[PDB]
Every structure is written in C-alpha cells, then in structure tokens.
C-alpha cells in the first residue's frame, strides 16, 4: 500500500533488504539523453521555482515556509526553526547546484507551497565489511568490490509541503522533479534521512539528549521530572545539580577552529571516518565550509597542544518553536556534528562540547547513535529519546548495517 514508493528504485520490504548481499544500483542504466528536458507537469495554478540561495529574500521565503510547516511532534509542542543563516550554510556547500533546490509557488501571488533541496556529497557506499567477508568465503570478491570507489551523489533534505496542501499527493511530484533535475546532471543515487519509516532503511538509530538547562526543559515539557526525584525535598534543585557543568573547558589548549587548521582537521577527520562502512569524503573546501565557525550556525573547537592539532569537535544550532508555552518561544538545541580524538578519550573531548554549548546558552544537546556516539552516552549523562532517525538510499541496494557503521551526519 505505497502508491508512490512502490513505483521507485528502492528496496520494498525488510524481507528484501535482508537478502541484499552487494552494494549496487537498483534501476536500469540510463543517460542524460533519456531524461525529460521539461519539468514534470503540474496543475495550471502552480509553477516550479528555482530559488536563489545567495539572495536574502529567497532564503527568507524558504525560511518562512519551514518555520510554519516543517517537522513537528504529533502533540504539536515543538517545530523546527532552522535560521536563514543555517539554510544558506546547508544549501550552498562548495560546488552546489542551484537547480537542485526545487520549490513550488502558486502562479497567482507567488506564495511558497512546497520545497525540497538537494546538495552534492562525495560518499563511500561500497559493500560493508561484514558482507565483504561473506563474499570472500563464497569466492564472490569482485562483485562485492565493484562499487568501492567514493561516489558523487545527491543529499536530499528539507522536504516540506504547506499545511493547507497536505495529502494532495504533491510530495511525490516534488520527489519526481528533484530526481529529474539530478538525473539531468548525470547523478543516479541520493541519500536521505527521515524520522518516519519508509521503504526501506539501510540503518536506524535512536536519538539521545543531554540536558543543559533542565529547568527550562521541564517547564516547556520537553522532558519530565523522573519519578525517583519525587523522593527528594526539592526535586528541581537535585535535577539542576545532576546536570550542572563546569563554566570553562577542561582540556588545556582548546580554542576555536581557524582557516589554518583546515588540513590538520581534514586529515584526522578522514582517517577516523574511513573506518566506517558509509561516510562522506571531504575536500579542503568542504572541511572549511562545514566546520569553520559561523556565528549562530556552527561551532567548532580544536585541541592544540605544542602547536599541533590532535583533536576537534563540532556542533550546530537548530532552534525549535515552543508552540504551546507562553513564557518561552524557542528551544535552543545543539546537535553533535563531526569530531575526532587521537590524544584523549572521546568522553573527555565531548565533555568540553557540553561545557561550551552550556556557556553559550544552549538548552539541550542532541545526537543520533551514529559514529562512536554510544561511547560517551552513560558518563556524560545522555538519555535515549523517543525518535529514531532512519537512513535511506535512492537507487542503491545496500545490506542492513548498524548505526555505528554510519559516519554521515545529516543536518
Ligand atoms: C537521483 C536523485 C533522487 C532524489 C530523490 C531521492 C528521494 C528522497 C525522498 C525525500 C526525502 C525527505 C527527507 C526529509 O526531508 S524528512 C522531513 C520531511 N518533512 C516533514 O516531515 C515536514 C512536515 N511534513 C510535510 O511537509 C509533509 O507531510 C510531507 C512533505 C513530508 C509529505 O507530504 P503530505 O503529507 O502532503 O503527503 P502527500 O499526499 O503529498 O504524499 C504522500 C506520500 O509521501 C510519502 N511520505 C510521507 N512522508 C515522507 C517523507 N518524510 N519522505 C518521503 N516520503 C514521504 C508517503 O509515504 C506517501 O507515499 P506512498 O506511501 O503513498 O507511496
Ligand atoms: C536529520 N534532520 C533533522 C530531522 C530530524 C527528524 C526527526 C523527526 C522525527 C523523529 C526523529 C527525527 N526529522 N528531521 C528532518
């Protein structure tokens, strides 16, 4: 009972994905020549729009659609409020393709109704290690290695239909058109994540949260006071004590990342990431873009001892609209980004991320159990959340992998 997804080059059931042995495409080979020159048809009262992401008002129109219409919980307590500066950062990495940003406007008054974005990413997506072992056992080694080389693909994000236009089958149309525009650039795979179950994920991970401002979080009902705190005279005071953090970082020689750090950071990030089955490949220009501090958006610190960069961590800001509470309008969240540690334990490095995030006024720290995120959950007092992030490929058969074999952070 998937009227759109049953027509698409993706695995259809869990049953199917459990059979998948090698990495490779699902669909027949095509060329740009085969792909329609003309945009996908839509009703006369609508039009396709390619927004200019370097133009303030275009960014602003995207910003407003998402502020009022993007991801919210079922209870309508919190909705994502990605800033305009964030969207510019996310949608314009080095060598991005303007045409990959796809919008629907109604022809009359140019009111924004729908959006999807695609950005290029170089991604390793060859057969995972545990299946490459099985391939060596069966003498099927060449088939498994076929697609080992890093692939220049599309990363899809920010799919959004206006609340007044939900359940009108407009989302398939958006995906079709995005797929068209990407295929026209000779790109045949995409990667995307979603908090919902679609057919069919290659990886799934729980969310984890670390309270930095427990009193605000309880007030806005993001989290509750655990039942066991009731056996105390002052439950909230104990909760504040529990999550309290040092005012300053502990690691001597921690500082913000500068441009000269680019090659050192790239090197240690790539060494670390290459040990995961699925993970991005970053050039110098992409390390600069994604990791250099930008106020209100992305925050990156390095550990520098005796003039050498040995560790770094990064995190990014996504605030959420506090829909129901009157005293607060925003939930200020910090999301664990990329990192690498070579001189110290990971929990020691990430502690400073929590320290820094706290001193900057962040209410909470979020992450999915990808990378080695599980290694510091207990000691830094993260708790599992209710959501799961699922990871998906478009037009790529991939075996099931654990979330700790995923090295791609998605914004
Ligand atoms: C080569 C390059 C290829 C590029 C493309 C790669 C594919 C990338 C795919 C996009 C990656 C997105 C990554 C993110 O950004 S994840 C975030 C998605 N956005 C939100 O959750 C924001 C709030 N919601 C909305 O704006 C709408 O409810 C959306 C737009 C989500 C659906 O609109 P609406 O509620 O008006 O429904 P409809 O009648 O138009 O259409 C119903 C069809 O849509 C399927 N549906 C529902 N939710 C999702 C979802 N999150 N991903 C993919 N499909 C989804 C559903 O199964 C059904 O198909 P089928 O079951 O009948 O077959
Ligand atoms: C990776 N991008 C941020 C995000 C997170 C979620 C989400 C939604 C519901 C449950 C868990 C995660 N959706 N989106 C779009």
UniProtKB/TrEMBL annotation:
Residue ranges of every copy of the Glycylpeptide N-tetradecanoyltransferase N-terminal domain listed in the record: 26-203
Gene Ontology, cellular component aspect: cytosol
GO BP term, example: protein localization to membrane
Chain intervals for the UniProt region annotation (Disordered): 1-15
Binding site for CoA: 2, 4-5, 161, 167, 169, 171, 193
InterPro entries (UniProt xref): Acyl_CoA_acyltransferase, NMT, NMT_C, NMT_CS, NMT_N
EC number annotated for this UniProt entry: 2.3.1.97
Residues annotated to bind Mg(2+): 165
Domain of life: Eukaryota
Catalytic activity: N-terminal glycyl-[protein] + tetradecanoyl-CoA = N-tetradecanoylglycyl-[protein] + CoA + H(+)
Broadest EC class assigned to this enzyme: transferase
Keyword terms, alphabetized: Acyltransferase, Metal-binding, Transferase
Keyword Nuclease carried by entry: no
Domain Glycylpeptide N-tetradecanoyltransferase C-terminal: 219-402
Protein's UniProt keywords contain Glycosyltransferase: no
Pfam families reported in the protein's UniProt record: NMT, NMT_C
Molecular function per GO: glycylpeptide N-tetradecanoyltransferase activity; metal ion binding
Binding-site positions, tetradecanoyl-CoA: 2-5, 159, 161, 166-167, 169-171
Family in the record: Belongs to the NMT family.
Described function: Adds a myristoyl group to the N-terminal glycine residue of certain cellular proteins.
UniProt-recorded name of the protein: Glycylpeptide N-tetradecanoyltransferase
């Amino acid at each position: 009972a998937h009227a759109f997804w049953s027509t698409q080059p993706v695995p259809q059931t869990e049953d199917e994905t459990e059979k998948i042995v090698f990495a490779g495409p699902m669909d027949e080979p095509k060329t740009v020549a085969d792909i329609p020159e003309e945009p996908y048809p839509i009703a006369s009262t609508f039009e396709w729009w390619t927004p200019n992401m370097e133009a303030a008002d275009d960014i602003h129109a995207i910003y407003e659609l998402l502020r009022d219409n993007y991801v919210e919980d079922d209870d309508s307590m919190f909705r994502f409020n990605y800033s305009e500066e964030f969207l510019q950062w996310a949608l314009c990495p080095p060598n991005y393709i303007p045409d990959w940003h796809v919008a629907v406007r109604r022809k009359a008054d140019k009111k924004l109704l729908a959006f999807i974005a695609g950005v290029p990413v170089t991604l390793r997506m060859g057969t995972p290690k545990y299946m490459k072992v099985k391939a060596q056992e069966k003498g099927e080694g060449e088939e498994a290695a076929k697609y080992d080389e890093p692939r220049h693909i599309c990363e899809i994000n920010f799919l959004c239909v206006h609340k007044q236009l939900r359940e009108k089958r407009l989302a398939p149309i958006l995906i079709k058109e995005a797929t068209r525009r990407v295929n026209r650039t000779n790109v045949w795979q995409a990667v995307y994540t979603a908090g919902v179950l679609l057919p069919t994920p290659y990886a799934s991970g729980q969310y984890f949260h670390r309270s930095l401002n427990p009193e605000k979080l309880v007030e806005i009902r993001f989290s509750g006071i655990p039942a066991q705190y009731q056996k105390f005279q002052n439950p909230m005071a104990m909760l504040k004590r529990n999550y309290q953090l040092p005012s300053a970082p502990k690691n001597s020689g921690l500082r913000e990342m500068k441009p000269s750090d680019v090659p050192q950071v790239r090197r240690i990030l790539m060494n670390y990431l290459d040990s995961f089955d699925v993970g991005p490949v970053f050039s110098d220009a992409e390390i600069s873009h994604y990791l250099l501090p930008r106020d209100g958006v992305v925050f990156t610190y390095v550990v520098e001892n005796d003039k050498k960069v040995t560790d770094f961590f990064s995190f990014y800001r996504i605030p959420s609209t506090v829909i129901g509470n009157s005293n607060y309008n925003l939930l200020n969240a910090a999301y664990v980004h990329y990192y690498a540690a070579t001189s110290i334990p990971l929990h020691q490095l990430i502690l400073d991320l929590l320290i820094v995030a706290h001193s900057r006024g962040f209410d909470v720290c979020n992450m999915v159990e990808i990378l080695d995120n599980r290694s510091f959950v207990e000691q830094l007092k993260f708790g599992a959340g209710d959501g799961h992030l699922r990871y998906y490929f478009y037009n790529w058969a991939y075996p099931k992998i654990k979330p700790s074999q995923v090295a791609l952070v998605m914004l």
